[PDB]
C-alpha cells in the first residue's frame, strides 16, 4: 500500500482544540495531501528567513490549492539568524507574491517572524511570537463546518427489496441528515431520479432520521430495486450534480508500494474508483509530458465514460484490474 510517514500532535489554545500533522519528507507531504490521509482546515507554511522560498515551498502551496486547503498562515523561521529589517521585508514580499501566484490572498496573509529554535529553548522574547502565531490560528482560520451541517449525501452500498414495503438502499451517511418523508435525489451513472424517503431502518429498529456517520437503510417510494446502479448516491435534491470531466492531482504508486512496474503514456485508459465502483476514463496529460513514472504526482485531466456525482475535493483511486495503481483528488470539475 501507500507508504506514509506522519506525526500527529494535539494542543489547545483558550478557545479551540487543534490536531496538527507534520511529515518528514517532501514525498510524504505529496502522498498525504493527495490521499487525504492528513486533511487540513488551515496550513502553517514555514519558510526559513535565511534561505527564503525554495522549490518545495512553492510545490506545497500549489498542492494546497489543488487539494483544497483553504487558508495558509506563514511563519518566517530562523529570524534569530537574520538581523536586517531590509532582508526580512524582502523575503516577505517574495512569499506574498508566491501565495498570490496560486490564488491565496498574499496581501491579507498573516506572516509571523520568529524562531522555533529559541522559543523551544525558553527565551520568552521568542516564545511571544509562538503565541502570536496561535492567535492567528484562532482568528484567521474560521471554525470548520461539521459533517452533519452539510447537505445529505449517502453512497449506496447495496440494495434490497423488502416485501410489501419497498426498496431499501444501504450505506453509511457521509454527511448531513435524512428524515422520513424528505425528498431525495439518486444521482450518477443514469439520469438523476427523484424519490421520497418513506423510512429509515437500522437492524429492524425503526428510525426517525439517519445521521452523518450512521450505517442505515433508507426506504424509497416506488423505485424498483433494479433501477439502482452501482456508483450512484442518495443526496438532498440539487446539492450535488453528476459530472464526467474534471481536473485533478494524482499520485502514482511506486513499484514498491505495489503499483505499476512500467510508466504509462498518453492514451492510458484505467479505471477510476469513486466511492463504490470503477468507472473507465481517458487521460489528458499536461503539455510536454508523454509518460508518467511510477512514484510521480502529476496534474491530470480526466474524462469519464459515465457520469459520477462529484464536487471539488472528492478523492478517488486509479485501478488497473482491481489493483490500485494511483490515488487522486478532484481539483476542479469541468463538466
Amino acid at each position: 500500500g501507500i507508504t506514509i510517514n506522519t506525526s500527529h500532535v494535539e494542543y489547545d489554545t483558550p478557545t479551540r482544540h487543534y490536531a496538527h500533522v507534520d511529515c518528514p519528507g517532501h514525498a510524504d507531504y505529496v502522498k498525504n495531501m493527495i490521499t487525504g490521509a492528513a486533511q487540513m482546515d488551515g496550513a502553517i507554511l514555514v519558510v526559513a528567513a535565511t534561505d527564503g522560498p525554495m522549490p518545495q515551498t512553492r510545490e506545497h502551496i500549489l498542492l494546497g490549492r489543488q487539494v483544497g486547503v483553504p487558508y495558509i498562515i506563514v511563519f518566517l523561521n530562523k529570524c534569530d539568524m537574520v538581523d536586517d529589517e531590509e532582508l526580512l521585508e524582502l523575503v516577505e514580499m517574495e512569499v506574498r507574491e508566491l501565495l498570490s501566484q496560486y490564488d491565496f490572498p498574499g496581501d491579507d496573509t498573516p506572516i509571523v517572524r520568529g524562531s522555533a529554535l529559541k522559543a523551544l529553548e525558553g527565551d520568552a522574547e521568542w516564545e511571544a511570537k509562538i503565541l502570536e502565531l496561535a492567535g492567528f490560528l484562532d482568528s484567521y482560520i474560521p471554525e470548520p463546518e461539521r459533517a452533519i451541517d452539510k447537505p445529505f449525501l449517502l453512497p449506496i452500498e447495496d440494495v434490497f427489496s423488502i416485501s410489501g414495503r419497498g426498496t431499501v438502499v444501504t450505506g453509511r451517511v457521509e454527511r448531513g441528515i435524512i428524515k422520513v418523508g424528505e425528498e431525495v435525489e439518486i444521482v450518477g451513472i443514469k439520469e438523476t431520479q427523484k424519490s421520497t424517503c418513506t423510512g429509515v431502518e437500522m437492524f429492524r429498529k425503526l428510525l426517525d432520521e439517519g445521521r452523518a456517520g450512521e450505517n442505515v437503510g433508507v426506504l424509497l417510494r416506488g423505485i424498483k430495486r433494479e433501477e439502482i446502479e452501482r456508483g450512484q448516491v442518495l443526496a438532498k435534491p440539487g446539492t450535488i450534480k453528476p459530472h464526467t470531466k474534471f481536473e485533478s492531482e494524482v499520485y502514482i504508486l511506486s513499484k514498491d508500494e505495489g503499483g505499476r512496474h512500467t510508466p504509462f503514456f498518453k492514451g492510458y485508459r484505467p479505471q477510476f474508483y469513486f466511492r463504490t465502483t470503477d468507472v473507465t476514463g481517458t487521460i489528458e496529460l499536461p503539455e510536454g509530458v508523454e509518460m508518467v513514472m511510477p512514484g510521480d504526482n502529476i496534474k491530470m485531466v480526466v474524462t469519464l465514460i459515465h457520469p459520477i456525482a462529484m464536487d471539488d475535493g472528492l478523492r478517488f483511486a486509479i485501478r488497473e484490474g482491481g489493483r490500485t495503481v494511483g490515488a487522486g483528488v478532484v481539483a476542479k470539475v469541468l463538466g
Binding site: 506525526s7 500532535v9 494542543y11 489547545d12 489554545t13 483558550p14 478557545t15 479551540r16 482544540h17 487543534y18 490536531a19 496538527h20 500533522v21 507534520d22 518528514p24 519528507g25 517532501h26 507531504y29 492528513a38 486533511q39 487540513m40 482546515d41 488551515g42 496550513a43 502553517i44 507554511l45 514555514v46 519558510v47 526559513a48 534561505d51 522560498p53 525554495m54 522549490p55 518545495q56 515551498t57 506545497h60 502551496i61 498542492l63 494546497g64 511563519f75 523561521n77 530562523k78 522555533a116 529554535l117 522559543a119 523551544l120 516564545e127 509562538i130 503565541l131 502565531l133 496561535a134 490560528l137 482560520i141 471554525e143 470548520p144
Partner: protein
Amino acid sequence: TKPHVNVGTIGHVDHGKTTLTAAITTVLAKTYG
C-alpha cells in the same frame, strides 16, 4: 466543548517545520495549561 481544527506544517525541508511543531506544543502548555 471546544471547536476542533485540523492544521499542519508544510514547507521546504530543513526550514523548521518539526522544530516549530515542538515549540507550539511546548509554549502553549507552558502558557495555558
